[PDB]
Every structure is written in structure tokens, then in C-alpha cells.
Design a protein around this ligand. Sequence first.
Ligand SMILES: [Mg+2]
Ligand SMILES: [Mg+2]
Ligand SMILES: [Mg+2]
Ligand SMILES: [Mg+2]
Ligand SMILES: [Mg+2]
Ligand SMILES: [Mg+2]
Ligand SMILES: [Mg+2]
Ligand SMILES: [Mg+2]
Lengths: 275, 275, 275, 275, 275, 275
Amino acid sequence: AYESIQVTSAQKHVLHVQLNRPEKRNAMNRAFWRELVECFQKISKDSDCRAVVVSGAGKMFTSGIDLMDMASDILQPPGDDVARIAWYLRDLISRYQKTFTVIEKCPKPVIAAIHGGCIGGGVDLISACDIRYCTQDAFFQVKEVDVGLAADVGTLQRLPKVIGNRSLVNELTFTARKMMADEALDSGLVSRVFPDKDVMLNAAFALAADISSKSPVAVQGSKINLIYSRDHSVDESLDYMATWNMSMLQTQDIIKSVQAAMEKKDSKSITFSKL
Amino acid sequence: AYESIQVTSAQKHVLHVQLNRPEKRNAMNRAFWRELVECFQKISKDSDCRAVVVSGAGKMFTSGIDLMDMASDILQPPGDDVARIAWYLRDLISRYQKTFTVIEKCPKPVIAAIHGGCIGGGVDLISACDIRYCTQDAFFQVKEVDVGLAADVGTLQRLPKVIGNRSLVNELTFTARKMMADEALDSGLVSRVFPDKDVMLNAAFALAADISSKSPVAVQGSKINLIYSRDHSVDESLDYMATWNMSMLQTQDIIKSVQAAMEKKDSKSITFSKL
Amino acid sequence: AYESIQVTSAQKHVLHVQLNRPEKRNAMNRAFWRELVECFQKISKDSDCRAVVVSGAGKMFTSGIDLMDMASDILQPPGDDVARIAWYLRDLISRYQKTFTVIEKCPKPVIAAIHGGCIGGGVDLISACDIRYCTQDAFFQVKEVDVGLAADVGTLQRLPKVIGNRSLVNELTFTARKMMADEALDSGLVSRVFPDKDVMLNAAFALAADISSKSPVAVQGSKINLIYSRDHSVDESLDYMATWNMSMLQTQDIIKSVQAAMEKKDSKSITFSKL
Amino acid sequence: AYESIQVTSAQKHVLHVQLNRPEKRNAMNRAFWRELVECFQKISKDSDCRAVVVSGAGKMFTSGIDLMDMASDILQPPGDDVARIAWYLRDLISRYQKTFTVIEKCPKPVIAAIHGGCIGGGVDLISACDIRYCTQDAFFQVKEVDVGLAADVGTLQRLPKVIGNRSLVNELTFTARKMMADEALDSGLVSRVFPDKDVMLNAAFALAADISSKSPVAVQGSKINLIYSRDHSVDESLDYMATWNMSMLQTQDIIKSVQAAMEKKDSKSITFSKL
Amino acid sequence: AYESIQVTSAQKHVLHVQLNRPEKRNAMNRAFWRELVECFQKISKDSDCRAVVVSGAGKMFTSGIDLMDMASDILQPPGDDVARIAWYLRDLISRYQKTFTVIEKCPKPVIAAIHGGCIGGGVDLISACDIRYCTQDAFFQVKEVDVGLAADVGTLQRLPKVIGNRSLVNELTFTARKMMADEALDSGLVSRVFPDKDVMLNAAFALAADISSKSPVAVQGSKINLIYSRDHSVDESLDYMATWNMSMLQTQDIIKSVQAAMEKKDSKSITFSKL
Amino acid sequence: AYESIQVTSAQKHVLHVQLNRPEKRNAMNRAFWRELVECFQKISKDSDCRAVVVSGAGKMFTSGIDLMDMASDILQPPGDDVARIAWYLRDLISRYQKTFTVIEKCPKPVIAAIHGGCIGGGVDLISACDIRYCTQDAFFQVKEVDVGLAADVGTLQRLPKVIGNRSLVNELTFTARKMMADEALDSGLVSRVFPDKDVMLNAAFALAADISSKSPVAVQGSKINLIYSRDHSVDESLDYMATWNMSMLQTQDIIKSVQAAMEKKDSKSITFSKL
Ligand SMILES: [Mg+2]
Ligand SMILES: [Mg+2]
Ligand SMILES: [Mg+2]
Ligand SMILES: [Mg+2]
Ligand SMILES: [Mg+2]
Ligand SMILES: [Mg+2]
Ligand SMILES: [Mg+2]
Ligand SMILES: [Mg+2]
């Protein structure tokens, strides 16, 4: 059973992954790093799920890493010389990066719905998601320099590739200052702001349901190629897209869409097969 | 004598490429994919053209792909097994991507001037242009998921590389929702919004004239290197730029400009040779 | 020491690099291209410096390149044939690019504080800095096309990688038009605008002091990995980050920062060792 | 009705492309650069061809570029300044590189069968082919430095990627010395050496027939992925291969081969559909 | 433990991974693809192992993939349309690639000791190992085209990156012909040939023991950086190497190795800590 | 004055760089790492030099690093915590890599002429050279694992990219065993073997003179593009080659070569201008 998160079926095709340690403001304890990997690897193979919503139980999205677990992991490493310590740490860092890379490698769209603070590992988490919504009281903080380290589980790799303003990204990173909702929306880190958590969740789940109404081949192939396209040249990415759609265009999802158009039936009334 | 587009000389150095099937809302049919390649390949070799404006005839920029021409192209493919159908489809996708890659590979700046809807293939087109202007009634839609396929002619590869907000790009792509002019300006997809098509085209042709008054070596070398720099690291791009300008700095265009500066002569009075 | 710049110790750990030819509007003459390289190479090895502020003396940040020196270097080149001229120009361009590349390769965060005009070479300089602030009267101009050349000392390689709106980047580059402070803030080129130079400098120095109060290992490792991550895929950048932090997490800065957090003390109360 | 080459059907599925200006030792003149592009573009779309053999008519494979056609192309270029001459030359070089890039971009295996000298442009040609055979009297020469230029139509990009010994490649390139058949076999530039042209062409057409007896999906997908794998990391190349074979494994070519294996039927008796 | 392989501790620090279905000529059935991944993932974390030897039990190294299992997995796929079939096959191919990729990602050197036939999947396996030895009766065959598919589990991505002669690589791939031991040695595919399996194994184990007598930090860091350097530019690889050795040079293995050199003692006389 | 090397003018256009600490078998002391950088940076800018020969004074090419200097550099590093030690070591490693990278970044061809042992840093040196010749008594040794470290100054980055046999490269690296001349020639690491040092040097200088007789624009542009081509795809490298030769074909070196051919004068009688 997951002890640090809770996964529920919100509605057809939609999975809700909720950070669930509210008494610690969803701090990321050691086991969370394994649990979120297990969770998203399962979601990736689940043929019924078409979209994911991520939120936090309690008063805020996440306070970030569990500082005592961090201290045990990093300040008490095994190894009888510095090279052997580094060998251990490289494996540790690589394993913790996987906690948020599984979100990006999940072909289903993942929607983060943030309320209150989203601190430290929270920003690494949400920058690996596809769509980000927040509440008016939310705030974001690349807290790691205040802990004595450069963020290593995805923020520096992905945050600069989800918004345009690099001066702001650098200021947030080097100072660890909070960015409140108004500025988060202005920056584009979030694409919508809601007055409270209930209204935001309603909108997040309505978005996930709308995505789930569409062909899953088209939606999940879109995510896959948006991610490929971020990291490769336009020409390399067009070449990959032709190699991708030479099989994916051979789908009944297009046949059904064309049949609907000919019959003058809205596309939301089509049923697509599992993926 | 094109079937789907019309190319005219607007004014000195400026070509106007107009999508021209107004009775069919400029739907992109079979000939369109071949003709835009022919058109921009000729523009690229045209030593008198320094800038291009692209617009649509009739009520809207484009309704996108012609669905029954698409059904013919994709739903009745030749091939006696899936691998052979995929062979055919890979070639088709590759050819149709070239329709918009030729805009990027044309060294002259290309300005898209959108009025009304710009749907599906329309967003693949405008995201391959350099500068985008639109009217107050314009709207943009990454419609492909509603037809059962991930966009494959450029939107996924270029759209996220022309605006900063990746949460918004992902929402647009997975939902196929319309983005209206105000939001398109806010996102930076378009540079300027105008009240109506006439005012927009006046400003687009004024922008094209202004660009055409500049050294063509400087302007077209700037487009070539901005594109190279998007796809390569800064250090690789600086190395390429040094190899580029070791030839291109050997021009009378600079000597003329330094001489004008020395005499206190406006740089707008200088005439530059063809390119 | 220097002919074209002046370097002062503003406050603990902060260096102020001031363009210092106010009677010539801080034009970038031959000495400037050599001196900035010497300066930032020394700052990169200075174990007491943790942050840098760059500003200009007099009326404006910079009028840009000295055209007379440029013509001597570029319109009067050694070389008895075009290939031999190009061999010399390749090296010249490479050396002038280094003037601004040393700002990016300097591990300390560099804050540009712009007042009045920032023209041509000034945009190449500020787009190699990390954080950009300006005054209400500032303006920015990618002036190179008006001189007859595509900008080659950094703007084309870095400006599109510091802001999201590529339509604006292309319009600024191809027309060489001025972008004023309100639009610079809107575009994200600058992340803060101030009423005057004094207020701006007070905030830039306060920002530099805040940054300098943090672990230098964490801040400088953050800059190094933000730059690496811009130019590589997310997966390559995560791999690099694990190989980086397998040594950099082995620091007393974590114990010190965590202890301070436990006692509710600020970063400024901690003494981190030199770097 | 080519002026510089001749294309014939050797036998089922095999095309023979012969350099055909024997009175001028198959010198590569102006029409040759255009015609080899036309020829291989047609071969690439020819669903009956599965393999190609390239040879030269007359006394030798090729003497290389036609020097007085080269003088015309390069020494009398249009352009009223150096930058404009370079614009013209970049386009020329790019077009002439396509003459040999089309061989690599053709998915059918291309076998070069060299007798006598293979000089300058000859090495750019054969290094773009997949398999190389030669006669005992054959010789290879990277002659370009003796004409005053670094080879630009493929040798420098491909030759070091078809043999292992980089010291030898560098010596050949900087000295322009001839490499004879024995050394060409030892270096691995050629796979097999034959006593005379007739024996070599028999073996080249036997090799082409053998390749043509195999599944064309398997053979041409193997060439496409060997080329992709040369230019990308192993992990990027494995990812591309999975995206390629998720379509291409859906073929009757495998079902037929497993069925033959089940019955104990030679795999040489199977017939495969066109591609 | 395993159904298709057997793992034994040969001698101190050396593990022997033996393909172990001798009655079936070590055919690679469904279990094998899972088991090799489990095996090398465990060896990668085994702090006592420093080198691995891979061999096959019975008459031959391996006959390659089990065709019946392959047909079940590949000619009988789940999926109600071609796109959904491809979605499943992409994952299948990706998982089978991991079977051999874990050998490359294992930081310990892996020595392949081949006797008799090494067919199809066997070449994919040995081209992911580091050092290859064979017997006089061994032979190698890139058999996949004879099954109707382009090899997808590593040969095309790694074989051309382990030997220099690309004409030979292409001939072997397109014809599926056998390459015997003398030619395998000549090509560099194997670096040593032995008269029989016993003599070969004695030398492979002696090599593994020699390797294991060296600092494991130095040897495993050497493999990691040889692999990184294959896939990146020399400049990127040098940068990575400096970021790697800034931790790995901080080891007692240097003091120990240098002290032994000063006393004229061999590596085997030193005790290096586990890794 | 260089204390660890000696540079002489061997003959017109040829520079001889000789390792010159023969009483220590040319061991690489601390200052050598700076001296070779100063030396090749000067040679790179020297317009009279067209080729370089590198050899060692005394009984052998080089015994490799000075072990006591290594111990002082690496085993006595400054820094009050492991991260600050790593900061120092990264800068040290980067600086020592430059010692051999300057050889590759020198546009003139560099010929290594090895006699006796070429140990440790000797292999990093010669693998950065372009052409390698040796004597019958020579031997090569990737000695670093015997010292407790993975080679970091170029061998792992370049050795695998100068020869084809990766199994041999891995065996040499992991065991640190010697490779004698016969095997070095067979591998292709050297391209010629001579009976003794005098005969080898005569041949090295005759090769350097032959290279120096050719156009320096063609020779040095060839080196530059061979190196670019090793590290980039063929398509990227052809694009760079067109951008390179759009200026370099505009040389009198080609005019003179064509005039010689028309006059029936051998090309070795042409005089080319300095570069
Ligand atoms: Mg609980
Ligand atoms: Mg805004
Ligand atoms: Mg129906
Ligand atoms: Mg002066
Ligand atoms: Mg079974
Ligand atoms: Mg001495
Ligand atoms: Mg050999
Ligand atoms: Mg003469």
C-alpha cells in the first residue's frame, strides 16, 4: 500500500495522485522517492488511464524534502574514501531524479494542481508535469540553495524549459525567494489561477476529463513528440515524428473521427479503444 | 498558375503569398502541399525579394486540412502489409512537413498576417514563419487531436519553440481548444494585434518594407543564425557564427554604413545590392 | 588598471564592473574587448567574489561598438586574398565573442543593471549576464543590421534563450528597432524596472548581497548546471547533474545551512568558506 | 537520356549506375552533379529496385572533377562583393554535396565497384556508398589539396567514418598521395579485391542479387538504422530503432520466414512483396 | 535461480555468466530476455565484482532468438488496430534492447568468450560487451535480415562502433553471411583467437583477474568514460571527464598504487576497497 | 625559454617540437603542462609554419607523468571540504587537458614520431596528434589504471576515435599492458614503422615538407573539417563545410593551381602565401 501518496480513480480514465502526509505538509520522506516511481510506472502501463491529476492533501501542496532523511542520506554516506562516497551519491541522486522523470516518461498528460506552498522538491515535481494550475494563495520556491545544495532532481533541468523568462529563473534559483501566484501566472509557470482549492480541482478534473475524451493515441503521441521536440533540433524532431506517425496514423481513432464528421456527429460522442 | 495559392509583388522587394481557396476557407488540399514547396523554393533563390508576407484570402486564414483529401491520403494507402503502408506514410508525412520547413529554410524573413480562424495545419504554418501578426477576431487551434492524430507537420516541433509558456502549449495541444487574439498576444504567439485585416496588412507590408530597407546580407544572415542557434548549444552556435561572418563581414554593406555614420547620414538613405 | 572599465569591491563578496568611458557613452573600443576578458577571467578565479554587478558610468549603459575601431579591424584587414582575410576575421570574431562568453563561463551570478540606452554590443553583453534589471528610461536595441552585419558576439545565440517570444526576437533583430523599458519588462528581458539609476543600483547590490549570503557551492553549482541544462537534453543534463553533485554534496555548507534553519537563523548569520 | 551517366537494369531488382564519359575518364562535369541527384532520387522511389551497383565506363572509375568546368563554377562567380560571392558559393557547394548525399539517403544498398583510378570526387562518391569492391589495379586519391581546396563534397565527412585508421586518413588527405589496392584492402576501405573488372562486376552483381533476395523491409530498414546509428548516441539510436520497428515488424516478411523455419524450408525460396 | 543462464563466482572478484540451455543451443527464449537484465542489474550493484566473463554452455555460444517465442510475442500481438499493436511492440523492442544495454551500463568490464556459432542475438550481445575473445571454430552472423527484420536489439547501434571497416559491417548486415574466426580477428571484432574453448576460457579468466587486480575506481571510471566519449564530442567528453575525476581522484587507490610502484610490487599485492 | 621542451625550425615551414628532459626519459613535470600550451598556441598563430613534428630526446619518447608532481598536485590539494577540493581538481584537470587539446586545435598537421616507450601521458599526447609514426622498438601503454586513476587528459576521449578495434582499446585501458610496434601498426594507431629513430625522423620531416608544399588554406581547412566531422553528424558536418568553403574557395591558391595545370607545370613548383 502506498504510505506517502494516495491514488484514486477520479472519474473514467482519470487517476488522482495525491501527496498524502498532511500532518507534515506532504514532506518528501525517503520512501516517497520510491513510491512515486512505482506509482507512475504503473500508470504508464495502465491502458485505462488517459490523464493524471496531482495534488496535495491538507493545507499545502508540499513543504519539500524531509530534512532529517536528507541528512541521513547525504551526511551519513557509506564509503571509505571520497571516491567511494561519490559512487554511492551518484546512484542516490540518479534514483531520486527518477521520482520526477517517471512523470515526464508517462505518456499520459499529467496536471499539477497546486494550493499553498510548493517548496523545493515541489518545484522539481511540478516542472516535470505537463500542465500547472494553482490557487490564489499558492507560492513556489526553488529552496535548495538555502539548504546548501544546487537542486538536483529536475528543477534546474526543466524549470527553464517550461517558462521563458530566464532572468526570473536565475533570480529564483540563486536567492531561493518565494514566487506568489500572481507572478507565477505572469511568468507562465502556471497557466490558470483559481480562488480556492475546490474550484481549482473541479477545473483540473474537468480538463483531465476533456483530454480523456480525445483519442489516446493522438494525445499520448502528442506528449511523446512534444518532449522529444524540446530536446532535439526541429529537423531531427520532424524526422522522428514521421517515423512515429508512420504507424500511429494507422488507427481506427482517425477512421472513427472521419466517420463522425461525415455523419455530422460531434467528436466527443466517439468511443476510443484502450491504450 | 498555382491552384491553391497566389503570389504577388506587393512593393519593392516584398512578395505576398496568399492562401487562395476562399470558397473552401483556404483548406489545405493535395496541391497545396506541393505548391508551397515550389513557391518558397523559388523565393529562396529570388535575389530581388528581401521579405515575405503570408495571408489568407476570404473570411479566414485557414480552416486547416481538407478532411476528405486527408481521408484519401491516409485512409486508403497503398501497401500489402503494415510495414509497406508505413513506408508509404513516412514518405507522405516527410513531404508534407517540407511544405512548412521551406518557410524556415527560406533566408528571407516571413511574416504571417492572420485574420479569423487559423486551424490545425494553419498553426503548423504560422509556427514556421518568423513574425506573427493577427486581427482582433483571429483565433488559433491545434486541432489535430480532434481528428485522431498527433500533429505531424510542424506544430509540435516549432510551437513550443516560439512561445515561453509550456503549460499553455500542452493545454492547447491536448484539448484542441481555441486560443483567441487577446490570449495569443499575451502568450507572445503574435507580436501585434490589429482591429481589422486591412490595418493588419498595411502594418505587415510596412514591416516587410522596413526589413527590406536593411542590408539583405545582415538580415538573412541574422535569420539563418537565429535558426541555427535555436537548435545547437550557445558555444556550437558561436563557432558557426564566426565561420559564417568570416565571409559575410566582407561586404560593402558595412563600409557603406560606417561611411554614413562618419558623415552623419541616415542609414535609411543607403542602397544595397541584390542577394 | 583598465582603460575602458572600472572594477570596485562594492561590499563583502560583491564586485562591481562598471563600463567606464562616460564621455564616449561607454562605446566598446578595442581595449574593452580585451579588458572584459581579463576581468571576468580574474573574477572567475577570485575565491572571495560570489556575485557581480555590471553597470555603466555616465548617461547610458552603452552606445555599443566603436565603429571607427571596428572599421579598422574589419574594413582594413590583413590578408592578400579573401581566404586569408577570412582566416583573420574568424579569429577576430572568436576573440570578440569571448568578451561576453567569459561572463557566462564565470561561475558567479552576474547582474546587469541598465540605465538609458543599451545598444548593439550592449544587448550581446546583457544577454550573457544572468539577471537583468533596468530603469524606466532604459532602452534596448539589436542594432547590428543597421551597421550591415548579423550580430556575431552573442545576441543571436543567447537573446532567444533568455526570453520566450520569438516573434518579438525576430522583429527586434530584423528591424533594429528600440525596445523601451515597459516592453522589456513585459517580454521578460529584464525582470525588474526601477524609477532611477540610484534605486536600481541599490536593488542590484542588495540582490548581489543576498546571493552572496548563500552557500557559494550551491549558487555557483546552480549557475553551472542551469547553463549546461540549457544546451543539452533533460536526460543528459540530469546525468551531468548527478556526476556534479556526487562531489558537491560533500560539503560543510549543507550542515551549516540546515543547522541555521533548525535555529531559525538567516543565511547571513552563517560563514561559508571561500570558493 | 543522361549526358554523364547511364542507368541499366542488370537483373531482377538490381540497377547499374555507370559513370559514362569514358573519353574524358568519367570526369565529373556540370551535368553530372545534377544527374546523379535525379538518378538516385528516382531509385529511392523505385519499388522494384532492392540494390544498386555503381561503376565507371572505360579505362578508370573516375579522374575526378572537370578542372575547367570547376574553374568556370568557382573562379568566375557572380556577386558584386565577397559576401555575395560567398552566398553563391555556399549554394553551389550545398548542391554538389547532394550529388553524393542522395546515395546515402537512398534506402537501397549501393555497391561501388572500382577499377583503375578513383580520384578526388571519386573518393567523395565511393565514401557515400555502402559496400566497396575494387580491382588489383585500382587506386584511390584524396586529390583536392593539390587543387588548392579542402575536399567539400563528402570525403572529409564520410571517409573517416568508413575506415578505422585515422592516421592514414589524415596522411592521405594532407598529402593527396595515391593509395593502391593492397593498402585499400588492408585499411578496410574496400571489402574485396579482384583480378580484373569483369570478375569484380560479376561478384558485385552477385552480391546485389543476394541482397535483393532478402526481405527489402529488413535490408532497407537496416541501412536506414545503420546510418542513423552512426550519427547519434547508442541510446538515441536504440530509441529510434524501437520507434522504427514498431511499424516494420508488422510485416508478412517475418511471418513467411518463421513459417519457412517451422517447416525446415530454405529462406532463399521465399518471395517478398515490392517496397 | 535462473532458467536460461547460470552465474558462478569464478575466482575472487570475477563472475562468470554462462548462457545455459545447451540442449537448445542456448537459444534466447522469453525468460532469457528478462533474466539477463536481472543478472547484470545485480552485478552492477555488487561491490565485490570487478569483471565479468560471458560464455555459453554446450556446443556453441548461441543459436540466437527462439523463433517460436518471437512469433508469439511479435506475430501474435495484442492491439485492436495497428497503432495499438505498435504501442505494444515499441515496449517489447525497448525491453529486449535492455537485455544487452545492461551489459554496457554495468560499470565492470565484461569479456565475451565465444566458441562455435554466435548467431543473430549473439552478435547483439557481444557487441554490448567490452572485450571479445573467440575460438578457432567460432563464427559470427548478423542473421536478422534472414528472419525478415532489421536487427533491433543492439547490433546495428553498436557493431559499427566496435570495428572500423564499414564496408564489411554493411555486407555482413545486408547478406547475413557467416564471418569465421580468422576474419573476425582481422576485422578487430575479436582481439584474440584461441585453439579451443578451454584455452580461451583460461585466458578470459586470467584477463578478468588482471583487470580485477587494478583499482576498481580507475577501471570502472575508465569504462564509464570510454562509453561517454564514444557518444559525445571530444570537447564534451573532456568536460565530463573533469567533472567525473574531480571526485574520483579523491581516492586512496592512488596512494596505494603509487606506493606499490615505488616498492616495485605488482597490483595483485595491493588490497583496494570494495566499490 | 622552454625548460621542458625544445622547438626548432627543421626546414622551411616545419617546426620540430621535441620533448627534452632526456635524463628523466621526458617525464611530464608540472611546468611541461603549461609549456606545451604556450608552444602550440604560438604555433597556431605562426603564419610561416605549415606542419609540426613531435619527438622525444634521448632513449624514448616519454615515460609519462612525473609521479612526485602528480602526488603534490592531486594528493595535497587545497580546500577545506571535499566540494572545495573538487572545485580545485576540476580546474586542474581542465588545465592539463588543454596541454593536448591545443595540438588538435592547432590548424597545422602535427606528426608524432615515437621511438621507445610512449607511456601514460604519451598516449594522451599522440592521440591528439594527426599522424603517428614509430620505430620497431616502440611501445605504447595506457598506464593510468596502474596509478589508480582513469586517464583524464585525452586518451579515453581520443584513442577510440583514432583506431577501429574497440576490444583492443578496452583491453589496453583496463589492463595497462604494453602494445609493441608490430601490434600498434596492425591496429592502425601508427600508420608506418621504421627500423630506427633516424630513419623515422627523416620520413617524418619528409612528410612534413610534402604537406608544407601544398596550399596551407587547403591543408589546414582539411584538418579543421576532419575534426569537426568526427564530432558531428555527416549532415551537420556537410553544412559546416559549405559555410567554411564559401570563403575558403575564394583563394589565389586555387587560381595558382589552375594556372599551373594550364601551363603544364607541376603543382609542387607553386609558391603559396603565408597563413
Ligand atoms: Mg500518514
Ligand atoms: Mg505577460
Ligand atoms: Mg459509426
Ligand atoms: Mg582608440
Ligand atoms: Mg518456453
Ligand atoms: Mg633539462
Ligand atoms: Mg589489418
Ligand atoms: Mg604563373
